[PDB]
Write a protein that binds this ligand. Structure first.
Ligand SMILES: Cc1cc(/C=C/C#N)cc(C)c1Nc1ccnc(Nc2ccc(C#N)cc2)n1
Lengths: 552, 416
């Protein structure tokens, strides 16, 4: 006395109708082979014959794997899939080993059978019709339609998985001491108890699926740990990326260096220290994955570190929600940070890296922050909680920064981890003007058309300077003018600019930029003792801005 | 007890599908409270599970209220609210009470519950699809659908406006000098009484809302008199430095683009020539007058500043340090309709984002009280940092729209 699997109401996209895709002429054997398949199926209840009415034919083919004695049919549903509505495929993200509790014992259950107990919406079967050409076009082709989720239909998985969970839902509910992952034709169950009770409860289960007539291959899961899943190696208490070593070549193409970045990137999950900058510095606006571009000595000394840290396999543990969850970040260099999340020293649940947002300006603190955030969510996603951070930045530094930064900013619970290089602020502009320090009115100006400009300054001590510049911009000069005032000045100095732009680049306290100029300005700032930047509105003839010296 | 046997004929807008919004991760504890909550909600048929044939989805997370530490379910119906608010006529939002913003005090009541006793258009329920995520995605989400009127839906207040008008008549006809507004699951009640005699008429509004149907013991206190476009102000010093004058001139230059008659000629004439920043400059005759005449222009109100019910309100916030923040609601550049300064309620509160978030809320609450429609904010934070933490400090049952300003406004201190 079986219980029925409630069907799922399925209809086509609004305003659209079914497939009227022509049937392509086959070959005697295939057409004959299909008849074989097709008959067995309907015998099993999978499909059924249909009359001359149903005008929804979907082209079917026939394939054999490779050097075989068996035939396999193939019904192409591409047409019906682009007309079938939309479903909620709950696969918007696969789990992560890092976030999995260790299981003393883990079973598996093939359900490549149950799948055929899940009925296709009655008012939808008609759309899944196909025709087996008959022999010698001397008869009508045999017409069939599905009574079960087709093996290649858009909504098959979506509905297969739903149906299954609904059946398990009440069992998992009365058996909190187990886990059930529904990955395809396999039903993986895990538990943490005497190897005796386990097997039993597995019976309590096999019995359950039997109330829906769901029959299974006697838990003789031909399988058994270890499992290779979506690139990992799972064991009763450890896991790691599937061995994907770094190739040995001399012919690295745009693709060969592209198929070594993803490997390191994916390897970054557990191998502590993976870097991909100098190898990312070999593919920007390229396209023809054939153009073999040279491996700079920068990317060379990098790929050589990779190969040796990838030799000794490194395993990640499992998540034990009882202990604290901790994360540590380190500044590698060049917008490169690498982190390790763990609960106990060296037993990293997972590890990673962070690549600076390629922005013209940014400092170490803004990055450390972005990483912390990036890590933070990824941890909410995986463990449902925020880790405790260990960071290379003195409390005092961080404070000075968030209390003075123009934007709002925050970092969850953290502690200073003294593991150099440390992150720091390299300089701070005075809030008021400096008494007794020379006052440098600077200014710059280029010529839109000739690209010729001047940069310079004039002060209270009579000191002066105007420099001519070839190939430059009305913004460039404005910066050089500050560069100059910073070069020809004492340890303390008040600078005055009318450059709204130039003020901004320093009100963001960048500690490194792309533009070499901005960098010497920095290098210059760092060298100073006290700097006071002041802005005054341009072209308003303001005592000091009598730098009609640049317009010339 | 109360509930309607009929469901208002609802539909989306033409050529607009439903809200297929991704769900963002939630922390365990929030997930647990959402699971419990969504249970009683099912054992009361406010919601019921759905299958794979429902592609639509809306974000959902948990929060806590003003003072209480009990998990509330908040649903971000923004994406729907725009596509769903296909229209609203003679159930139209509400002729805005231009008198609400004038009462000494104002309380904010929570009538979100009343909604959950009104069926929803069967053919519409599929659009209010939301998911309680799973930690790590170990198990599939727990999807649900709405049968009753969804809190936060900008439709529920409209649909219920019928039943609502009456639950108040005996009260409104009684105290006609009082104005009552309704935005979302919020009931805004303002009067001109004593803060003590104010609590009064309100306790009467609860003991009344109880029998007609309906945390109904939650209200906030506002004071719409203390809301203006703050004056711009120049210093009053007896001794001016080149820097002081340089800044003064800088600020007047900026304010000149808001007020016409602003002259700076004379002030900077006393700057001419490379003087040191820390040197004292005396004021001249021309100067002293020019400054004075400039203040005068500044004491008046800016001119031509009008609201345009159609257009949307921009809102800028600037972090000023020491827990001080400044803001300005406007629609056209240099035409603030309102400007303020949010203060320090929690002393040395080492959290900028919690502050920012309370700021955005108050600013929004005000915007509803004035023009009956929330503003679009320009937040001084990185999209990354903001999305990770706001929900952890949010408490309003509504949500404004927002973008991120990642370029330091020179203005920061002028509005200081
Ligand atoms: C994501 C996942 C993939 C597979 C299988 C995927 C594939 N192929 C099998 C299971 C059971 C799960 N889910 C969970 C949930 C909680 N604890 C565990 N523990 C656990 C899992 C595997 C091994 C091993 N070896 C040890 C302990 N698994």
């Amino acid at each position: 006395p079986i219980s029925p699997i409630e069907t799922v109401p399925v209809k086509l996209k609004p305003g659209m109708d079914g497939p009227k895709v022509k049937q392509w002429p086959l070959t005697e054997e295939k057409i004959k082979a299909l008849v074989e398949i097709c008959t067995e199926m309907e015998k099993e209840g999978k499909i059924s014959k249909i009359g001359p009415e149903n005008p929804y034919n979907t082209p079917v083919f026939a394939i054999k794997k490779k050097d075989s004695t068996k035939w396999r049919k193939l019904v192409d549903f591409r047409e019906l899939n682009k007309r079938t509505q939309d479903f909620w495929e709950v696969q918007l993200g696969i789990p992560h080993p890092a976030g999995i509790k260790k299981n003393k014992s883990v079973t598996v259950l093939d359900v490549g059978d149950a799948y055929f107990s899940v009925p296709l919406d009655e008012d939808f079967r008609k759309y899944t019709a196909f025709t087996i050409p008959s022999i010698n076009n001397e008869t009508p082709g045999i017409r069939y339609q599905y009574n079960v989720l087709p093996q290649g239909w858009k909504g098959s998985p979506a509905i297969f998985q739903s149906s299954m969970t609904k059946i398990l839902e009440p069992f998992a509910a009365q058996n909190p001491d187990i886990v059930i992952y529904q990955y395809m034709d396999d039903l993986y169950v895990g538990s943490d108890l005497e190897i005796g009770q386990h097997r039993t409860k597995i019976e309590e289960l096999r019995q359950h699926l039997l109330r829906w007539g769901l029959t299974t291959p006697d838990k003789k899961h031909q399988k058994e740990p270890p499992f290779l899943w979506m690139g990992y190696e799972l064991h009763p208490d450890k896991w790691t990326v599937q061995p994907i070593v770094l190739p040995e070549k001399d012919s690295w193409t745009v693709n060969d260096i592209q198929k070594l970045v993803g490997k390191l990137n994916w390897a970054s999950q557990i191998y502590p220290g993976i870097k991909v900058r100098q190898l990312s510095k070999l593919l920007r606006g390229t396209k023809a994955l054939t153009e073999v571009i040279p491996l700079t000595e920068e990317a060379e000394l990098e790929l050589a570190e990779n190969r040796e840290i990838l030799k000794e396999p490194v395993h990640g543990v499992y998540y034990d929600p009882s202990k604290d969850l901790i994360a540590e970040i380190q500044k590698q260099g060049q917008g490169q940070w690498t982190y390790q999340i763990y609960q106990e020293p060296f037993k990293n649940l997972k590890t990673g890296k962070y690549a600076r947002m390629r922005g013209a300006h940014t400092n170490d603190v803004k990055q450390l922050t972005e990483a912390v955030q990036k890590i933070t969510t990824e941890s909410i996603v995986i463990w449902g909680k925020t880790p405790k951070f260990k960071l290379p930045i003195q409390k005092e530094t961080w404070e000075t920064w968030w209390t003075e930064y123009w934007q709002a900013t925050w970092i969850p619970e953290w502690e200073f981890v003294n593991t150099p290089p440390l992150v720091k602020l390299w300089y701070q502009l005075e809030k008021e003007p400096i008494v007794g320090a020379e006052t440098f009115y600077v200014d710059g100006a280029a010529n839109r058309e000739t690209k010729l400009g001047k940069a310079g300054y004039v002060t209270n001590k009579g000191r002066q300077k105007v420099v001519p510049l070839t190939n430059t911009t009305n913004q460039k000069t404005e910066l050089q003018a500050i560069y100059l005032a910073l070069q020809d000045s004492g340890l303390e100095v008040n600078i005055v600019t009318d450059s709204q732009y130039a003020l901004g680049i320093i009100q963001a306290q960048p500690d490194k930029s792309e533009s070499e100029l901005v960098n010497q300005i920095i290098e210059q700032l760092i060298k100073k003792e006290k700097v006071y930047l002041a802005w005054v509105p341009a072209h308003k003839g303001i005592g000091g801005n009598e730098q009609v010296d640049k317009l010339v | 007890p109360i509930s309607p046997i009929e469901t208002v004929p609802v539909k989306l807008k033409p050529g607009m599908d439903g809200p297929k919004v991704k769900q963002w991760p939630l922390t365990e504890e929030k997930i647990k409270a959402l699971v419990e909550i969504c249970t009683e909600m099912e054992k009361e048929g406010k919601i019921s599970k759905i299958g794979p044939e429902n592609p639509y989805n809306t974000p959902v997370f948990a929060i806590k209220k003003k003072d209480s530490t009990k998990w509330r379910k908040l649903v971000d119906f923004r994406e729907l609210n725009k596509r769903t608010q296909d229209f609203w006529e003679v159930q139209l939002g509400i002729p805005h009470p231009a008198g609400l913003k004038k009462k000494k005090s104002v309380t904010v009541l929570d009538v979100g519950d009343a909604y959950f006793s009104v069926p929803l258009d069967e053919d519409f329920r599929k659009y209010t699809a939301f998911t309680i995520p799973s930690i790590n995605n170990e198990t599939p989400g727990i999807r649900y659908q709405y049968n009753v009127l969804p809190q936060g839906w900008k439709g529920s207040p409209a649909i219920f406006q019928s039943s609502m008008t009456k639950i108040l008549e005996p009260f409104k006809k009684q105290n006609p000098d009082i104005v009552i507004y309704q935005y979302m699951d919020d009931l805004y009640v303002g009067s001109d009484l004593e803060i003590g005699q104010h609590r009064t008429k309100i306790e009467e509004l609860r003991q009344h809302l109880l029998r007609w149907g309906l945390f109904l013991w939650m209200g906030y206190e506002l004071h719409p008199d203390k809301w203006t476009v703050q004056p711009i102000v120049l210093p009053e010093k007896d001794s001016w430095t080149v820097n002081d004058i340089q800044k003064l001139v800088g600020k007047l230059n900026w304010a000149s683009q808001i007020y016409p008659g602003i002259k700076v000629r004379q002030l900077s004439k006393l700057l001419r020539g490379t003087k040191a920043l820390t040197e004292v400059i005396p004021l001249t005759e021309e100067a002293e007058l020019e400054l004075a005449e400039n203040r005068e222009i500044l004491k008046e109100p800016v001119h031509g500043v009008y609201y345009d019910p159609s257009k949307d309100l921009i809102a800028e916030i600037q972090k000023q340090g020491q827990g001080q923040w400044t803001y300005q609601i406007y629609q056209e550049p240099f035409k603030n309709l309102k400007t303020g300064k949010y203060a320090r309620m929690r002393g040395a509160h080492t959290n900028d984002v919690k502050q920012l978030t309370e700021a955005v809320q108050k600013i929004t609450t005000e915007s509803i009280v004035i023009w009956g429609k929330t503003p679009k904010f320009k937040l001084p934070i990185q999209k990354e940092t903001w999305e990770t933490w706001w929900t952890e400090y949010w408490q309003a049952t509504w949500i404004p729209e927002w973008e991120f300003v990642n370029t330091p406004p020179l203005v920061k201190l002028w509005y200081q």
